[PDB]
Design a binder for this molecule. Structure first.
Ligand SMILES: NC(=O)C1=CN([C@@H]2O[C@H](COP(=O)(O)OP(=O)(O)OC[C@H]3O[C@@H](n4cnc5c(N)ncnc54)[C@H](O)[C@@H]3O)[C@@H](O)[C@H]2O)C=CC1
Ligand SMILES: NC(=O)C1=CN([C@@H]2O[C@H](COP(=O)(O)OP(=O)(O)OC[C@H]3O[C@@H](n4cnc5c(N)ncnc54)[C@H](O)[C@@H]3O)[C@@H](O)[C@H]2O)C=CC1
Ligand SMILES: NC(=O)C1=CN([C@@H]2O[C@H](COP(=O)(O)OP(=O)(O)OC[C@H]3O[C@@H](n4cnc5c(N)ncnc54)[C@H](O)[C@@H]3O)[C@@H](O)[C@H]2O)C=CC1
Ligand SMILES: NC(=O)C1=CN([C@@H]2O[C@H](COP(=O)(O)OP(=O)(O)OC[C@H]3O[C@@H](n4cnc5c(N)ncnc54)[C@H](O)[C@@H]3O)[C@@H](O)[C@H]2O)C=CC1
Ligand SMILES: O=C(O)C1(C(=O)O)CCC1
Ligand SMILES: O=C(O)C1(C(=O)O)CCC1
Ligand SMILES: O=C(O)C1(C(=O)O)CCC1
Ligand SMILES: O=C(O)C1(C(=O)O)CCC1
Lengths: 277, 277, 276, 281
């Protein structure tokens, strides 16, 4: 909606990325966004203010400003925040938890102590929403209305891919697209190191490697063909590419990426088990 | 230019990718493009014809049609093609070799036997030009005019990144952005396998992993910050991402990507040494 | 009506003769095979089939219309010296030897008669069950009809296609050596079944049937082997867990290593032969 | 000349395995496609479209599949089996043979669910694989408490029309899952890598795929038709000092054999682990 007001409890990296994406998309004017942090001297806080976002140290003011309320504090702080603002949740509120691991059940339990039927949505997104190319999934809670999920999807589709999932997939999504950008940043640093080793200036190597990864990812998104088929399509017999693919295989490249998704997913599950405990 | 006619000797994967990119960009109408192959029954040939590209089995007709002439046959076939069409090169022609490894010197030597001052440009591009997100470098030959390089850059910038380089960087670029898409396809297959292992449907895992890589690459292209800093920015203390980055490091992930760039570059150098020999 | 000869009466002569006779393209007694050692198990098996056996390579040549060279590669030049004067204009000489070039064969035979009809092939032992994988390249003087005849004959015992000669050493590393990679894999898969509680006989049968069915699936599908693997592997399931442990050992790289090592050894041996 | 003229077959679940089995049965000529019904809550699946083109009858309602069928294949994911049994348990009649295809799921668990509605359900548990689609599957089955002797013979007749089929004790089926259930995926991985090897050494990709697949097919057929040990068949390929023995050495140096043992073990153990989780629920 044009009248919709959005708030962020937690004015850090993710609040900045989403606010920048939303305002770049034009789906929200910056003045319709309020964010709160217990430290008005942060870099993200100053960046948000320059964009035109309203800032406050008082989470209650963010709640009173907002229709859609994003929880963008660290997961261990979620229970603290819900106890602080629980009595301020109203019927109009859609509470959107961005925290890794934290279950809809745990959120609904804390909030229902103050007012029955909190409308809760859980999402897992990632930092590339800042360039409107995020990957977002969401699950709807017990009292979320049908239009609540559609509203969520409309908003988050403005900054990237967005689809509804069952909540029990979100920890695995965290391991894949939540942590995914960090795998790519690591890969791009190393690819640039390889370019530099073979004689390219570092700035050109970074640009070429990032462009290669962006273009390849877009090709796969626009293709019906299997990634293995696209692999087959880009390796000439006896050529340079198939020689490089062999050295990746000899190091177990594929297994390392499987290891990574698994380790991030398992850590996410472990953190939440400690929270519930 | 609007009057410019473009030809491809070799109507295979790369000719299709460039022709699709050029026509999607609107910089060339398909009817201004001619491509030739000794087998009019190929899949790429049929795809090119549906787009509106002119096709012929006779390389001489492609030469007579064209102002800009792309050589898109395999590197070992370049010398054969130059001997076949050498007497047909005219003053108006810009000969653009896309072949990995093949030097401007070797091309100019073959063509100068027929007519002095062939205008030659060497490029290294990649398949994502098909979605207008290629990575292209080019080097200008002895008799290339100044406007020849600018024309080249204008044309190839319509389908992705394009910059001029010294020719002695092109074999390293091949190892990085030429082979790069294949590294990404391999990585995306493995990331999807990881998503599937942790419980995601395969189609969703492929979509999320590709979107993660696309978004991360775009973030780096739009950032002044170091990829290591972006890595630092997306890993919370004690969190899922830093746990996954550790298992990548324990397998030497970075070294495998360095190995790959090196192996592709070295194979490219080795193939050309065999050609010159 | 075709008379076929094998110089060499070993494993490949036996496999091809068994395949050809099971296909009904040749009567066993229209095949003649020669070896200097008639006390071999392969010779005893050829004899039981009804194949004609002789110690004299000249007799095999004079009997034959199509002449297969089925001796070890380092024996090929000795054979060509021995019976080169006996090659007639009617002969089609089919070298099965790994690595040995058409050029090397034609150089020897052309010193006797000027236009020897030479075909080079690379096949494999599953011709014995009519599921071989065969490629061939035609020599300088081989007629178009010679290639067509070769393809009809070798298609009776499996897949067969013409290739450029410069691919044959790589084919050797893939489908020539391939059956041995498969036998090794099947032994290990059976060991895995036995470790998890299956009787050996059942584990061997199930593993071999799994491999046969999967290979036939791929041959009958237009889909990529990665997509076929996706149709097996359910999210969180048993197969994707097993695929991970294969990946962690670099399973794919070992098979690439194998094809490469077989191809390179083939090229290296021929390099030695050309030097000598 | 086999044909079950009085047999109606149903599939609960219209996914990969339902398609593969229906394609194999119809290609074998033992069943007409219109005597097969399959149900699924998602009628926009590619597998559903393929079944429709074969002539298979399709419905969203599992009760209709039950009422149509004599032999009822359960072809849903293992964690969905208990929900299915609660849904159509009251619809099971004396005539039904319930054939569970689900990995891990025990006859005991199926019989307990169905027995709450009607005593003596006839249950058979099987483990098959996708190559039934080309009639070269590998299938094992175990008969349940109330299955008649004719039930097992009938199912062996049906499943033998699409590949190898043999009766086993149920305690072997999780290990079979790790070997021939997951087996085709090991083969697809191996064939992709073998083709990568052929391409590295200069072969066109299409030829490399064809040759590698044919090599694996022929070798598997050789072993199935031979009385000799796989090591002896390997000895007939490898000449002294030759190309093959050089390649086998590099496989050995990487522990190739151990990886395939690891795979069978990992798939079997995961199958057991998943069922232990189901029993705890
Ligand atoms: N950055 C990422 O890559 C993604 C982050 N997330 C989730 O988003 C949440 C935050 O992520 P980041 O923004 O990276 O953390 P961050 O640490 O950059 O920002 C956290 C913010 O919370 C503020 N804060 C701390 N205590 C507070 C309180 N009592 N009341 C209000 N604000 C308070 C801090 O001052 C800081 O501004 C976490 O739950 C994380 O799981 C999920 C997807 C990806
Ligand atoms: N595909 C890629 O990833 C990239 C390819 N390249 C270069 O582009 C060139 C071709 O690449 P692909 O298109 O992938 O090869 P491709 O094999 O798909 O197409 C090659 C084309 O050449 C044709 N051809 C063969 N002999 C010919 C002749 N005598 N006259 C005319 N056409 C003939 C073939 O019929 C085929 O259509 C190579 O030199 C390669 O190094 C460079 C950058 C990346
Ligand atoms: N066994 C296989 O898997 C395949 C073999 N080949 C090729 O087939 C040829 C033979 O291979 P195998 O049959 O495996 O070897 P093998 O050693 O089983 O048979 C070789 C035969 O040549 C005979 N021989 C030795 N000196 C002779 C002479 N002077 N005149 C006539 N015969 C003589 C030996 O007695 C022996 O019977 C080799 O060149 C090999 O590269 C190619 C494809 C597959
Ligand atoms: N795919 C394989 O390689 C093999 C699979 N199996 C077993 O076969 C069963 C199915 O395997 P796939 O067909 O590969 O799964 P799949 O996921 O392709 O098909 C599953 C089907 O179940 C349907 N479904 C979900 N809930 C349902 C409900 N309440 N009522 C009816 N249908 C419902 C889905 O829509 C889908 O059509 C699993 O239990 C698996 O263990 C066993 C051997 C091999
Ligand atoms: O030569 C080629 O086309 C390349 C290959 O190795 O596939 C693409 C970059 C080198
Ligand atoms: O909790 C977080 O913010 C994540 C991290 O591990 O950095 C990003 C995805 C999990
Ligand atoms: O349950 C299944 O479908 C299997 C899997 O791993 O997905 C195939 C054999 C086990
Ligand atoms: O020469 C031979 O017989 C071969 C070997 O490795 O021995 C089989 C394919 C090469």
């Amino acid at each position: 909606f044009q009248s919709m007001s959005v708030g962020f409890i937690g004015a850090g990296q993710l609040a900045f990325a989403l606010a920048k994406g939303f305002t770049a998309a034009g789906v929200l004017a910056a003045h319709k966004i309020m964010a709160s942090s217990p430290d008005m001297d942060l870099a993200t806080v100053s960046a948000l203010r320059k964009m035109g976002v309203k800032l406050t140290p008082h989470n209650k003011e963010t709640v009173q400003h907002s229709d859609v309320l994003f929880l963008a504090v660290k997961p261990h702080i979620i229970p603290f925040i819900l106890d602080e603002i629980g009595a301020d949740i109203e019927d109009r509120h859609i509470v959107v938890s961005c925290a890794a691991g934290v279950t809809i059940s745990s959120i609904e339990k804390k909030l229902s102590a103050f007012r029955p039927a909190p409308r809760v949505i859980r999402c897992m997104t990632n930092t590339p929403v800042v360039v409107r190319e995020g990957a977002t999934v969401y699950a709807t809670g017990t009292h979320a209305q049908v239009e609540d999920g559609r509203l969520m999807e409309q908003l988050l589709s403005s900054v990237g891919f967005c689809t509804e999932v069952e909540e029990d997939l979100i920890d695995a999504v965290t391991g894949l697209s939540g942590s995914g950008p960090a795998y790519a940043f690591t890969a791009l640093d190393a690819l640039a190191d390889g370019g530099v080793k073979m004689g390219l200036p570092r700035r050109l190597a970074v640009r070429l490697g990032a462009q290669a990864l962006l273009g390849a990812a877009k090709m796969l998104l626009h293709s019906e063909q299997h990634p293995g088929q696209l692999k087959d399509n880009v390796s000439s017999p006896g050529g340079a590419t198939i020689h490089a693919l062999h050295v990746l295989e000899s190091g177990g490249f594929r297994s390392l990426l499987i290891n990574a998704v698994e380790a991030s997913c398992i850590r996410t599950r472990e953190l939440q088990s400690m929270a519930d405990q």
